[PDB]
From Swiss-Prot, chains A, B, C, D, E, F:
Transmembrane segments: none
Outcome when changing residue 37 to S: Loss of infectivity
Assembly behavior: Homodimer; the homodimer further multimerizes as homohexamers or homopentamers. Interacts with host NUP98. Interacts with host PPIA/CYPA; this interaction stabilizes the capsid. Interacts with host NUP153. Interacts with host PDZD8; this interaction stabilizes the capsid. Interacts with host TRIM5; this interaction destabilizes the capsid. Interacts with host CPSF6. Interacts with host NONO; the interaction is weak.
Subcellular location: Virion
Region (Dimerization/Multimerization of capsid protein p24): 145-211
Residue positions, PTM Phosphoserine: 16
Phenotype when changing residue 57 to S: Reduces protein stability. Loss of binding to FG repeats of human NUP153. Loss of binding to CPSF6. Decreases virus ability to integrate in intrafenic regions compared to wild-type virus
Protein name: Capsid protein p24
Effect on the protein of changing residue 53 to L: Loss of infectivity
Function: Forms the conical core that encapsulates the genomic RNA-nucleocapsid complex in the virion. Most core are conical, with only 7% tubular. The core is constituted by capsid protein hexamer subunits. The core is disassembled soon after virion entry. The capsid promotes immune invasion by cloaking viral DNA from CGAS detection. Host restriction factors such as TRIM5-alpha or TRIMCyp bind retroviral capsids and cause premature capsid disassembly, leading to blocks in reverse transcription. Capsid restriction by TRIM5 is one of the factors which restricts HIV-1 to the human species.
Recorded consequence of changing residue 173 to A: Does not bind FG repeats of human NUP153. Loss of infectivity
Region (PPIA/CYPA-binding loop): 85-93
Length: 211, 211, 211, 211, 211, 211
């Protein structure tokens, strides 16, 4: 990544073994549960496009998903090239060239070029741009791998209200990577109590009532 | 977070894999036991609002609680906007804008803006303000998930006094996120001894007597 | 805590996840065995009162003990206020105020104030003062939770001398958070041998003889 | 490796125990699955040829593969010597000599020489050149140890489509260290559905249809 | 400990959680096997007397040994006071006092005083002096806890020579915290072979012969 | 070890707990498999002779081997003294003395002297010289503890070729701390195939053929 040193200047630092291992392990343990995306964003803080590719490429499983991600990336890269065309021909000697989509995605750009863009004044934040494309792709994957419709999250006859609401908001989070449906999907006993509370009741108030 | 470098100046640093993992694991292991809140406060030392959202969003379980937390945050954010209205219109070129509630909560503000506010002179400590709102919300959750009333913590016939008092003060801590009720809830044998000690007896003295 | 940077100046640093976890784990694994106190002192090197409260508050179990500790702290804080009264009224604009007992204990003081006192010239070492009060309290807890009187540590007929002396000095350490009683509590066979050695014999010499 | 210090200058740093252990463990856990190569590239960021040899030589198993790797390295080294012949005879006193293939591979060059080349202006990036040769060799090994032809990846009668596509793209990755064959190798039920979708369908769309 | 910072100056640093845990764990895992002493010396690199006491005091078991160690320390401290008497009376205002035995052992000296002595010019290396006393004491403990005389290390009829020699030199190391006795204690078959080799044979040569 | 600080100057640093533990664990897990030597070399990067002795002395097992190592070291030290005799008598006040063999091996030299030699201009690299002697000794130990002759590595009737070649090159590595013998030791079926390939066939080509 690119970080500020002790002196106060933006320099490249090697991606740490701790960062590499943390990402690989989150994917192994959590697959594409929604919370994997904020972990990715945090572990890739200050990442160059090279670092972002490293993180994605170190994943061994889920290769269908990783192929789907590459498709989203290529779509975003094509849209970048449409909005920001780069003049062809020979570059001015010793001057910074403009990044194409594939340069932002780290496939046709060198690390030195990536560092040049990211530390320029004004900076072309190719790492942040690429990360946005990756997260767009990861959001689609999270939605794809969401196992259950929110319509099928219903409280069991003996299921505690707290456990039901946890499943409900867990599913909501996965499905769109509400209080009315929550009441509708509650069990008969709890539903009667929730209907008595009236409109505008907070989740906190609903929990206390069915507890 | 924002930290002082070796030279002695406030700069942004990436949230560490160690910090990220520590928070995720405390929540997995302890849920919303009261001691999770001081751990949160310590792990989020110097946090920007972005860092605070990262920590909250990396939590995979307890999504009902996380939804309740967002409600508390929005309430605090609305109260901020009532007390500190921001003038609408175009901002002065190259000048620092005033933070709204949603800027403090990191939903409508960029990292650069957050850094600007937190390192300004005088600083607008948006991280500390947001953390206060989050902890208010976490305290409510701790109280909500407290399993037992202090009224139902009573010493068993064969339960050692030390074990009973541990349950008692554990419950007290959870319920409000005393010595009289402690005596009242003690078993017959211990109660007789504690009544003999008289008023103004310390917990230390009570323990020695029923030991 | 407060540490010296690379340049050579006292600055605040965030308490580390490693430090937080180490303390929590020692308490989980060792409870209030005597060796927990030197570990606490070492893990809290350079701690501010805020850091010390963090460490104490992150402990989830042993809440009776933690309540007893707060009592000892309040007693020490009251004694501080008796010896060092602070003049009431409005403070001089932009000047350092004098710490009361509750400021030293971190309940009525801010981190900024704590840093100000600890890095002042001359420094008011509020962290070291508070740590002394905490350790006084922890020593009482260690003595309280000591399971056995030294009078009841006696060598078994078949117990190796080395194992007996380990229990003996372990108990001595817990009870007051000697050679004569050691001999008196030895088994008949070993006692006869130890009596033959005469007075002024070192522990080393006693071990060799009953080995 | 060679890194930029706090002051902003390229200096040698010892390879870390964390890096050494991470590499050894990835090889133990993953053998030569394709994702081992990006992990190698990331763990060897800024590596000198000495560091690269250390990483390769610390591997205890897979010695057939390691011998095959040495062969690829020697081939690349010979091609380097053909393209870049070095003038024989005595070197100019106190001057930098030109690297031969075996110098780039770290077998006939000292660490000091490697540092000299890598930090020269312009730099001769012997670490990056060597790493390219190593990765060429590792790619061959990955292909060699690929257990299955893509022709033999076929969807089972009861195998979920998601599981089949994961095996498919996993095998594709190993074999060349597509959508048509994916459809051809699908089971009868899924194949009928995929044929109905028509040409130009994305993987995402195919998954939704057979889900 | 006292370390050199980045700028190049001797300053105090807090003992690390990693160091504290490493020492505690070595003692738990290895007790007083001979190799524990070089680990102690290495983990206490640059230690102040306070750090050395921390390390010793964090040990929970082996309290007989720890009491024996204190005796050795007090003996060394008394010998220091005999060789280096300190003038009594009031110290010169703002001047460095001379360390007594108990100051070197960290019982009557403050950290500030210890730092003053260790960073003085010329330095009074109180940490190194104390560590020498501690290691003298640890050596005695290692010898004390050595379970077997070298006279009782004899090769079994079916014991491989390599296994026998490992036990032999392991015991030698513990007992004094040779080739002739090694041959004498070998089994009949190996002994005959070793006698044929003649005098001046290396251990390497003896191993090859009985292998 | 001796490292370059942030400012860019050679200074002593304490050996890390991570380094100490890594070495101890590699020896426990791998004994004297050949790959232990490059791990030793890497873990001892920049080591002083004191550090090298620490690493060797922290090993608890394999004391026969450690005694054999000391013999190799003493032989190398004697050869050093023969090639580089040091003038006897009193040293020039405040001047650097010349290292003898035992000074290079860290038995008669202080850390300060070792640092002086290693950071001198020109430097006397006593750490690198000693490490060379240690590795010479470790190579002998690796060869000694090699369990099998390469003559006894033969492919089983049902053993996959890949597994056989792994054993073969593993043994080759241990025995000398080839393609013809590989073919000769292959099983009848594979041998026939390998004989058909003809001379000059690479290992890669042989693997493909018997796969």
């Amino acid at each position: 990544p690119i970080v500020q040193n002790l002196q106060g200047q933006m320099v490249h630092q090697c991606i740490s073994p701790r960062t590499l291992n943390a990402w690989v392990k989150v994917v192994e343990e959590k697959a594409f549960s929604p919370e994997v995306i904020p972990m990715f964003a945090a572990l890739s803080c200050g990442a160059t496009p090279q670092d972002l590719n490293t993180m994605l490429n170190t994943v061994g499983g889920h290769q269908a998903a990783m192929h789907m991600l590459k498709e989203t990336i290529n779509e975003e890269a094509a849209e970048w090239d449409r909005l920001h065309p780069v003049h062809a021909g020979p570059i001015a000697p010793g001057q910074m060239r403009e990044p194409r989509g594939s340069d932002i995605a780290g496939t046709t750009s060198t690390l030195q070029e990536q560092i040049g863009w990211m530390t320029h004044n004004p900076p072309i934040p190719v790492g942040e741009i690429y990360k946005r494309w990756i997260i767009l792709g990861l959001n689609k994957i999270v939605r794809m791998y969401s196992p259950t419709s929110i319509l099928d999250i219903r409280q069991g006859p003996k299921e505690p209200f707290r456990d039901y609401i946890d499943r409900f908001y867990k599913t909501i989070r996965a499905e769109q990577a509400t209080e009315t449906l929550l009441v509708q999907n509650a069990n008969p006993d709890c539903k009667t109590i929730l209907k008595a509370l009236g409109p505008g009741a907070t989740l906190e108030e609903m929990m206390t009532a069915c507890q």
